[PDB]
Amino acid sequence: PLKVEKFATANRGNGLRAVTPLRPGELLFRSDPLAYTVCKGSRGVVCDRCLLGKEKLMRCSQCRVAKYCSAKCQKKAWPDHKRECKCLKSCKPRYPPDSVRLLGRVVFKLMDGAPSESEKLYSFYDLESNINKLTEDRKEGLRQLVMTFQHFMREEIQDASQLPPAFDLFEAFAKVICNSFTICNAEMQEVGVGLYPSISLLNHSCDPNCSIVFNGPHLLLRAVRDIEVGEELTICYLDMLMTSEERRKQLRDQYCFECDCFRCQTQDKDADMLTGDEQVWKEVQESLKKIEELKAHWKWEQVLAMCQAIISSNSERLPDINIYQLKVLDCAMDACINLGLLEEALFYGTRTMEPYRIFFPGSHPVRGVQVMKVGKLQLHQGMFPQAMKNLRLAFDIMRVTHGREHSLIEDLILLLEECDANI
Ligand SMILES: *c1c2c(nc3cc(C(=O)N4CCN(C(=O)OCC)CC4)ccc13)CCCC2
Ligand SMILES: C[S@@+](CC[C@H](N)C(=O)[O-])C[C@H]1O[C@@H](n2cnc3c(N)ncnc32)[C@H](O)[C@@H]1O
Ligand SMILES: [Zn+2]
Ligand SMILES: [Zn+2]
Ligand SMILES: [Zn+2]
Question: From atom 18 of ligand 1, which residue's Cα is the shortest distance away?
């Protein structure tokens, strides 16, 4: 028996609403993807199927683009990979955009796979396309994505007979733009992209009552507030460290709607997000583009050096509540944790603690993971009372955002038990 249901909203198309009263932390829906693929920057860094990062990966001898954590992952991914493997091969060294590879797996799964559990509440055919709202610029880009698809899928798709019935490629890419899910690993690293059509019923809110968390490619939908019967479920489409101006631009360009929630009407937290000298954080925001680019390709040393040049700069610095300063603090923490610089990592991680409490209110999985990382760094350095306080606070957040069903909760309990034995 399902706790959620599809329904027609008054001005937001279709949505999800509660069949029953929901409490914080209650699991609402699990789903594998209908189709998914590894991101461009994580390809060869994480297993193509399970999206876990490893020292070494074994590669597909046929294409050599697909790489895996183990022999089980390579053999199990073969059915969903066999048709794409050789549009991939015989197109080297020309790797297609992530969206084109994503749609290729959608077509193969819809053509050759059985009815997907991921389409139980909502199918790929039902997905919103927002076609009558697309600008001519966005249409032009979708036509370039269509011809890119046809060129990449030459060897396996000759004609409309090998596409689903009434399947239009322009509209399919329109659905991908506004229904794609970025997949983040346990450490909140962007590792993949996938489609979850039943989950794609959730409308956006800048202050949601639900949350998404990923266990590999598997998705868990949870309540993070109290929700009463008939109340619509919402998730935040966007990073929390965005101003209302940046949220307006992204919700327009990608999702074709104007948000008039309370937070956007009052520019909630905008001023605190941009404290400090404007010229200083405009450079940091400009430099974050390359910093985040290097992080997407797991080049941690380059991330740290650029972040150190900002955090320990000889020129004027920013307060830690400035979102662009905060992002540099986060990138530097992840770079240090992963180069083994654990005292420098804790220095940056502890600094993000108070800004994260303000910008991730209630129960947000991003804060719970950040707090868990800080508590894990404190425990590894013998700061047992300080570590316990954060590890418990991480459990108070992540037990609502992450599940009994999420593997990271098991890892947190071990750290809690270990820290408890020490105390
Ligand atoms: C990766 C990372 C961060 N947060 C994430 C949040 C989610 C998220 O729950 N999600 C984004 C995709 N989305 C959507 O586009 O709705 C319209 C279809 C649903 C909501 C995904 C991945 C995330 C935090 C920083 C670390 C990376
Ligand atoms: C992932 S789909 C959500 C389900 C969608 N309403 C449907 O019927 O399939 C995202 C699309 O829903 C609409 N939408 C989502 N959140 C909205 C909101 N808060 N206000 C207005 N429209 C919204 C936008 O058109 C967006 O392109
Ligand atoms: Zn694997
Ligand atoms: Zn292959
Ligand atoms: Zn809003």
Answer: 179
CB 324 within 8 A of CB 288: yes
Q: How was this structure determined?
A: X-ray
Ligand 1: which atom is nearest the Cα of residue 213? Answer: 9
Claim to verify: residue 376 and residue 342 sit in the same structural domain: no
Q: Are residues 185 and 173 in the same domain?
A: no
Dihedral-angle region of residue 40 (phi above 0 means left; psi in -120 to 50 means alpha; beta otherwise): alpha
Q: Determine the structural domain holding residue 288 and report its residue range.
A: 272-351
CA count, 13 A, side-chain hemisphere, 308: 11
Checking DSSP bridges between strand 35-38 and strand 190-195, what pairing results, if any? antiparallel
Atom of ligand 2 nearest to the CA of 255: 27
Domain boundary among 327, 351, 375: 351
For ligand 2, residues with CB inside 6 Å are: 12-15, 128, 130, 178-179, 200-201, 203-205, 255-257, 259
Same domain as 325, residue 381 = no
Helical pair 300-311 and 278-296, crossing angle rounded to 10 deg: 170
| Cβ–Cβ < 8 Å for 97, 104 | no
* Cβ proximity of 68 and 48 under 8 Å: yes
Residue type, 120: K
Contact criterion met (CB below 8 Å) for 314 and 275? no
Peptide bond into 115 cis (omega under 30): no
DSSP alpha helix (H) spans, 233-352: 244-253, 262-265, 270-273, 278-296, 300-311, 323-339, 342-351
Boundary of a domain, candidates 150, 180, 210: 180
Report which DSSP code applies to 232.
Answer: B
Q: Contact 233/17 with Cβ under 8 angstroms?
A: yes
